[PDB]
Amino acid sequence: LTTFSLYTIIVLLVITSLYTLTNNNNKIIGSRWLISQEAIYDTIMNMTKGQIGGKNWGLYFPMIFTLFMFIFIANLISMIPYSFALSAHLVFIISLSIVI
Amino acid sequence: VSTLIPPKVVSSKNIGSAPNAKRIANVVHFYKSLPQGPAPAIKANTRLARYKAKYFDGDNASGKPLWHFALGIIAFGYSMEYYFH
């Protein structure tokens, strides 16, 4: 179909695996891979508690988290020597920035 | 003489002691939990949960599932190069 459409699917499939095949058993200790997604959670918790630091810091934390993870994953896609980023379609990134 | 003394009536010790709250908590909290807990996800049955079992276990921090998952994407665009050209 459309390469851009295909790459939106790949991103979704990567992100699901980070809380399924990384979040293994829902341990109260936390899986070795899942320690990363604890750290991301906490360093952005403490960052937007720093930056905005209201009672609405956590209220705008999901948006600030999916803007993190989107860019974090799409520069794994950009490391693939034949798969080309969604972010490399600049029109999506710039449009998103103006919208926000 | 006086036979009035602390021991005869005691009922302050049987509620006033602090570990009672913890005691009655942990008879409810524990009586049926597993004595360990089970291992990080390894099979959900789909014929790729077996792939997870060898490489992408929670206990594995080894780079193998990453390599495998990466290599899939390399195969896609490389063939598509030959599909467009």
Is residue A77 within 8 angstroms of chain B, CB to CB? Answer: yes
DSSP A19: T
Q: How many residues does chain B have?
A: 85
Q: From residue A73, give the alpha-carbon distance in Å to each of A11, B6, B26, B36.
A: 7, 71, 43, 35
The nearest CA of chain B is from the CA of A76 a distance in Å of 9
Contacts of B38 in chain A (CB under 8 A): 25
The two structure tokens encoding residue A90? 């600049």
What was the experiment behind these coordinates?
A: cryo-EM
Other beta carbons within 10 angstroms of residue A6's beta carbon come to 12
- Non-local (6+) Cβ contacts of A27 within 8 A are A34, B37, B40, B58
The two structure tokens encoding residue A15? 């992100």
Is residue A32 within 8 angstroms of chain B, CB to CB? Answer: yes
d(C-alpha A99, C-alpha A88), whole Å: 18
Nearest to A27 among B42, B58, B70 (CB): B58
- Non-local (6+) Cβ contacts of A4 within 8 A are A86, A89
Is residue B41 within 8 angstroms of chain A, CB to CB? Answer: yes
Residue A17 one-letter amino acid:
S
Tell me the resolution in Å. 4.7
d(C-alpha B20, C-alpha B58), whole Å: 38
Rg (CA), chain B: 31
Is residue A33 within 8 angstroms of chain B, CB to CB? Answer: yes
DSSP B39: P
Is residue A11 within 8 angstroms of chain B, CB to CB? Answer: no
Q: Do A82 and B73 touch (CB under 8 A)?
A: yes
d(C-alpha A50, C-alpha A64), whole Å: 13
Q: Do A80 and B38 touch (CB under 8 A)?
A: no
